[PDB]
């Protein structure tokens, strides 16, 4: 109890930081337009970023490691100040050291920290390209289905097939985001009986592909045209593959634990080597170093699995908006090209 | 009012800098030719870049953050000089510190600043390749349409289809540049009734694709030849996808706010750590450091969304010039190859 | 014997480290899901990584080089302390040097160490993409076989062909992992007589491809449809090629021996240059430098051949689970699309 | 005149440097073979590069910026020496400063300089791959035309078509090199009347493509075989696109002017901060720093537009040599494969 | 003679180093297997690399530049020691300087050295991927020929065609390795009369392609199947293109001479700036700096043209072994799939 009521009060702050950053992963993102870019490039961005630093969830996640190292700096400083005043027995030395060992290893720590964050940014870029390809393939496939499928006996199957190409990016988004309601997001895109078959499947994006693939086998098409249409499905399998490996396989964990351990050991003895030159400036110096260096690691950690930093709902809605515009433009494009003739 | 007439005079300079850089985003760019490369590689480039530094809009955007840090250096220096002359009560210490904490963290700041600018340059390169592919696909598709389409009953549809392949890059350029007049830019490329249907569409580059796709369904072609032609449309969907994700999804904003915050905190205490070694040289030193380090961040910020730094009007005009040269060379190439035979 | 009983006691620790890390290469990995990402991003990761540092097998592999350099620091320190007390003849100088030569070469060592680890991480990423492509191709090929193959006379050949597409990733996994039992892993995927032919082949993933390729020649298909199906086999040859070159061709060994030699020479004279500023702090300083710098090299060494850090059994089971779900959804998707009609 | 006869004598050296480097862009390059690699890897390369440093045109281009900064170092040193001897009124201070501000910003300058040169090398690599693809596509297309085209009535058209595939890389080389004589380079590759049509076209590589595309429409081919042959033309459009964007779009000029300005300001005050430690060694120190740091920038500037550093004439001659060897081997390969049968 | 008998004794060591490294380029390499990876990752690699440092040919190539700089350090040290003892007239100053100029430029030298070696490693990776693609294409093409070619009248042509797909990687290996005996390496792969036609061709890998391309025109195939088979030849043209550009076009030589010149000037004045702090420790310090920094450049130089560091004979033998296993498995796979039916 005496070691169990103190081990629980120490968890109050890290638990709050953990609850705060997870709520920030569930925030809804929006695509940038032109006026958001003007605000992004403004000369006031430096002041407004500094003023928004106590509402940023990166900095709130950094509160446990920054306070822990700052108390260690205060403890080392208090002990050193007490020794300098001869308040201790005399066997107790001053916890000081040369900064030369840290000068030699300072560029290695920086290069390793930036390497891990560059590896994390590469995973964000790969996630962004994969979604770009899936949305451009869904737009392309839908555009070709509106042109290719001519026969009036295939009106219902063409309608059904265009509903599954719009539903596929929504299914993939629900497959990669933790609390997702695919039933709610597909309620007005799929038929009531089509959505029951998808909801009974463990791999829902896989199930929509199978409806698309079976629909292309039932259309009255020449075989050359069908091979052209069913070659557009492979981008959906590629999308599923790339997105599932980014959630399944993180950056090799030996590299991420090395960056953690190196940053913890460096900030544990940093007050000891800074003492001769700084004295009690070790406290604010350790505070600023821990806040600056653990924030480079925190940025990389938060974008390592990148699907919650992407506006997947706005990208999915673009395909739906593009397909309904094209079904309304069809009579007026057909008329104009018949007039040409 | 007393705190509201001073909060407004402080906005005069950042508002001017913001109006100056946005006007520089709307400047018209031209493709480099050989004599511009000779001028670019000249030994006078070092002098002429230095002389053009007060007309460069990067440096004008840097005027608010550089003056703000320079006044902070002047305030810290004035306070320190007043303390050294014993003009203050005596409880007021000298704002000085060891430079050793900044020596240890100097390589981390540099690596992070160059990482953000490299990420911005990667987005410029991706925007450049995407336009290269769309212009080469428009040239290829047009070249094949001039060869493939033979039948004299399809003369008007071939004319119409070649107008939409030239119009597509203009539509995509108007779709990614903020103040664009697609009606003015397509006035002499599309028919009056064809341009009305495009102007009524929310996704105009999408609408031109649908005219191309419907035109290929109405041509008297063998099915194998039609599949070959409609496979050339996918580069247009890819172009739309890549260009829309560069405007919709910026570099993850946690990484860009970290570079901003780190640069602001570093220049706020930089006069304090430089005092013992520099005294009033903290003012020009802080001026040069803020101007040098915030300019690396400013370059990255301005090319992060890269379409205004690209000569999209000259690249679009190349496709138009290439297609009209090919329609004039057609009778003389046909004659020469008939002579061979 | 006197030089042969001491040369054997020195091998006790490196042999134990070598047996410990190899047992860690044979540990079974699991795909990350959402709750493992929450635990990965927690604010307690910094404390729990530090507490798990004496059970991490990277650090146990670092035990021989870190102790060897720490004893060298103790030997140099003991000799220097004995000279300072005039316990030696007097011809014996103090083993001290300026740190200026190491200050000039410190950034070169860091850049080279991070380059070798970045090259190793690039090989891990290439291994990860190759598996992503092979699993997405196996999913795509299986999905098309379930749609394409219609004829009821080809029921047994379609069953057989879907067993070989699920078996191929298991065969490739057994081909790249050292102690593998392909007979045990293919016992319930292949027929008893089909598995005997695969087990008699030296290149088992190659043998499964040949069964797939022969099965596509015996199906009653139109030739255009067969060419479409046999074009899906090339991703399996590409998978075999990429995976075999990662095991056959390491990072050029001249670059890896340079990083080893540079790190050994740097830690051999590091106590000599640190003495004037540190005295007996050369022992913990050399301990921390050797542990920090050889751990960056160790991470790169352990992920250089990356297939044991990948959850190849879970990725292989995903294809098997996806194909059996699709064979159970087939009657209910066929019914729904017939109802449409 | 007094300010106009001195402004002209100062241009003598930069004009000479500009005339010298442009003449080096027009030098003819040759492909490396095995004995040039042995000479390239020799242990004498370090001495022979140092001895050839006053004939290297990079160093001659660096002569204006290196002399300008060296005279500034001499002026600052002369003024400081005159002040130390009390030869001035006494209101004149010594132009000295702490080197600490430059120590903090030294790693930022290095990282930015190497980033710009890496961006320039990436443009050289992209230019090299684009030429590799165009030459391999010209070899592939020619090889297929020699096999595919069988009919004896198409002998003259097959001859003509193989002349245009060899002529296309020569036309593209003349299109990207400033003083080119396409008439002289195509005089023995094209017919006299075919070369007149190409010379009358503004986009000559585009004109050759149109002859190839029209020749494939006039051959007596099955449609499936023609689609296979005309799919080999797209690599030529891709080649034109990639090569034209490298000449049209340089590295964003905001990034290149920042590297210029940073290097000029750094070498202007470098004698002032080096004085206390170096005195008149500021002159050779500034000379070596300006020569070393402006040479990293000069290398990047000279390879930024890379087509003059590539042996485009030797790569073009390889396609011509490969096609004539294949037309002489045709009777003896046909005989051997008929003997098999 | 007096200046000609001394200019020849100085060439003894660089000539020996040049003869030693070229003999190391001709050593035969073997593919890594699992037990070589265990030995590669062992904790004894740090000791065994250090012990093998006087048999490594990188270090033997470094012997001329390391001895030359070490004698310069000995000459500068001897002159400085003689001046300190007043053994000279007195007009002779001490060759000493501040290390501050080298501290500012130390990170630029390191970044440039690692950039050149990263560029060299990128050329090794490109060479490795190109061979991976050619071997996977040869495996794929052979696998399809064994399935596709059915007719019993084409037995000899199928045999011949499978001999040319195995012979092509051997021909490409002989085309990129300096002393190669293509006649000896193709003696048991090609027919005696087929090998005479290949030996009479200047571009032997090109000649084998032409036999493959002519063999596919003589087979009794449907045209759709022939187009599928002749599309597998393009990877051979791509392989030839990528491999020839790596031997023809080195890293731009302006960048490689800059790294050479910078490293030579840096080690020439390094004893002068290290003297005040080191005295005769300038000799071992210059020895270690020259050995460490010129070894990073030497690694890059030796892998810049990478084909001799690749096990091209083992990769070529894998295709031959895979094709003969598949011709022996053909009767037993045909039997098993006929039993299914």
Residue numbers in the entry:
A (entry chain A), B (entry chain A), C (entry chain A), D (entry chain A), E (entry chain A): 78 to 418
Sentences reproduced from the published study:
VCCN1 was recently identified as a voltage-gated chloride channel residing in the thylakoid membrane, where it plays a key role in photoreaction tuning to avoid the generation of reactive oxygen species (ROS). VCCN1 structurally resembles its animal homolog, bestrophin, a Ca2+-gated anion channel. MdVCCN1 forms a symmetric homopentamer, with each subunit consisting of three domains: transmembrane domain (TMD), N-terminal domain (NTD), and stromal domain (SMD).
Accordingly, to test our hypothesis, we determined the structure of the MdVCCN1 Y332A mutant reconstituted in nanodiscs by cryo-EM. The overall assembly and subunit folding of the Y332A mutant are quite similar to those of the WT structure in nanodiscs, with RMSD values below 0.36 Å for 335 Cα atoms, demonstrating that the Y332A mutation does not affect the overall structural integrity. Consequently, Glu195 is directly exposed to the ion permeation pathway, and thus may affect the anion permeability. Consistently, the pore radius of the Y332A mutant was widened only at the position of Phe192. Thus, the Y332A mutant seems to mimic the ‘partially opened’ state of VCCN1, whereas the whole neck opening requires larger movements, triggered by the conformational change of Tyr332. However, the Y332F mutant exhibited greatly reduced whole-cell currents, whereas the Y332A mutant showed only slightly reduced currents. Taken together, these electrophysiological and structural analyses demonstrated that the inter-helical interactions near the neck region are important for channel activity in the VCCN1 family.
